[PDB]
Each structure stands twice: as structure tokens, then as C-alpha cells.
């Protein structure tokens, strides 16, 4: 997270993280008790979701390390075409139900699509600098603004679909490598999932690109609304 700051600890109780061992893979969002939403390009055969975390190295005390027993990418997501990022979404089913409270808790899915100029929040453990990477130990937060789609399209010509949403900052706040799969929160709801962006991060002319969650409501709800 460029141009941001260290989040107040556990102020994003929905924040998740994908670990393989001690190696941090991606961010994630807790949208249900046993359900974690992330980016499809983070798919791995085996990994563990960590919740209630702030410092990667240090014990904060909320941490819950829960393995995932099912990975469900979006059926129209394509790993073949690189740079076709459309439908970058995956739901991870947790073996165990998460223990919930002020420190850990699912976030409501946004039932509205957003509007340009909407101020939002991104969080993650991804690099705080770019191009020279610095991966912080503590979760970082930044405020961003929803870009109009046609500015988004012109920023990445031909690469933007209606399942994507652009969010950027004049002062350089942007998601970066290691934040993928993490939350985009607008008005206390989950508006998006960190998908991809430009090189370097935090370019005034290039906003971050997030999977537009208002478009996927019926697919997420169906899977997480099942008997699983
Ligand atoms: Ca910790």
C-alpha cells in the first residue's frame, strides 16, 4: 500500500491474508463466517488464511490460522490469458468457522455500485514503496477515490471490463504487489477486491484496478449462501 499509513490495529477486522507457511501470498477479505474472498490469480492447491492479524512477525493476539478446504475461482476467470484479468475473483472456504468480534468479523458486500469521486479505503501488507519494494510488517491503510470508467478505460486501453473498477489517488495512495486479493471498502461495505495495476504503483495517471463487487453479488451470495 503506497502513500498510506499503518492502520490502527484491527480497524479492518475483515482483512485476511493467504499464507503458504510463513510466506505471505495475497490479501483476502472475510465475507462470511467460513468464507474468504480474494483474487483468482492467488489460487494455490494448499494455503492457510490468517485473520485478526496486524504485525506479521509479532503476536497481536487475535490471530486465527485456519486452513482452506475449498478454492472456488470465478468460472469465467482465465489463467491462460495473461493480462486478461477479467473476473478476478475467488472464494476460499475455511475448514473452521472463524471466531468473531471487534477484532475479526465479516464485512457486508456492497449492494450498490459506486459513483465517481467516492472515497474508499484499501489495506494490505503489500509493498509500501515502488518501484523499490518495501514489504512492511504491519498492515497499511490508504484512502482512494473511485475513478470513472472511461478514465479507467483510457488509462488501460482495451484491458478494462465492467467487472472492474478503478480507484486512485492524486497524492499517490495505491495498492501494489502483495495487496492483491485485499479489500476495497467504500462506506463500510466491500466495493472491490485488489486485482492489478500499473508499474510503478502510485502513478497519478494510472489508478489501481479492482474487481467490481457489485457486479458479482449473485455469484458470491450463491456460493456462500449454500450449505457449505
Ligand atoms: Ca501478528
UniProtKB/Swiss-Prot annotation:
Activity response to pH changes: Optimum pH is 8.5. Active from pH 7-10.
UniProt keywords, alphabetically: Cytoplasm, Disulfide bond, Glycoprotein, Hydrolase, Protease, Secreted, Serine protease, Signal, Zymogen
Domain of life: Eukaryota
Activity regulation annotation text: Inhibited by a range of serine protease inhibitors including antipain, aprotinin, leupeptin, benzamidine and soybean trypsin inhibitor.
Catalytic activity: Cleavage of amide substrates following the basic amino acids Arg or Lys at the P1 position, with a preference for Arg over Lys
Subcellular location, principal: secreted
Tissues in which the UniProt entry reports expression: Isoform 1 is predominantly expressed in the pancreas. Isoform 2 is expressed in adult brain and hippocampus. Isoform 1 and isoform 2 are found in fetal brain and placenta. Detected in salivary gland, uterus, thymus, breast, testis and kidney but not in spleen, liver, lung or normal ovarian tissue. Displays an 11.5-fold increase in Alzheimer disease hippocampus compared to controls and is overexpressed in some ovarian carcinomas.
GO biological process: keratinocyte proliferation; memory; neuron projection morphogenesis; protein maturation; proteolysis; regulation of synapse organization; response to wounding; synapse organization
Glycosylation sites: 78
Listed name of the protein: Kallikrein-8
Organism of derivation: Homo sapiens (Human)
Amino acid at each position: 500500500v503506497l502513500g498510506g499509513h499503518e492502520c490502527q490495529p484491527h480497524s479492518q477486522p475483515w482483512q485476511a491474508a493467504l499464507f503458504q507457511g510463513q510466506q505471505l501470498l495475497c490479501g483476502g477479505v472475510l465475507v462470511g463466517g467460513n468464507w474468504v474472498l480474494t483474487a483468482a490469480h492467488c489460487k494455490k492447491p494448499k494455503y492457510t488464511v490468517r485473520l485478526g492479524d496486524h504485525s506479521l512477525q509479532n503476536k497481536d493476539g487475535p490471530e486465527q490460522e485456519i486452513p482452506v478446504v475449498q478454492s472456488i475461482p470465478h468460472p469465467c476467470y482465465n489463467s491462460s490469458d495473461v493480462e486478461d484479468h477479467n473476473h478476478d475473483l475467488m472464494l476460499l472456504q475455511l475448514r473452521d468457522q472463524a471466531s468473531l468480534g471487534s477484532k475479526v468479523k465479516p464485512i457486508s458486500l456492497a449492494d450498490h455500485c459506486t459513483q465517481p469521486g467516492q472515497k474508499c479505503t484499501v489495506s494490505g501488507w503489500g509493498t509500501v514503496t515502488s518501484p523499490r519494494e518495501n514489504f512492511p510488517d504491519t498492515l497499511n491503510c490508504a484512502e482512494v477515490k473511485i475513478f470513472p470508467q472511461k478514465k479507467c478505460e483510457d488509462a488501460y486501453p482495451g484491458q478494462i471490463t465492467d467487472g472492474m473498477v478503478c480507484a486512485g489517488s492524486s497524492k499517490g495512495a495505491d495498492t501494489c504487489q502483495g495487496d492483491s486479493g485485499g479489500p476495497l471498502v467504500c462506506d463500510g461495505a466491500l466495493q472491490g477486491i485488489t486485482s492489478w495495476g500499473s508499474d510503478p504503483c502510485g502513478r497519478s495517471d494510472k489508478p489501481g484496478v479492482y474487481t467490481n463487487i457489485c457486479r458479482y453479488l449473485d455469484w458470491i451470495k450463491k456460493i456462500i449462501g449454500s450449505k457449505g
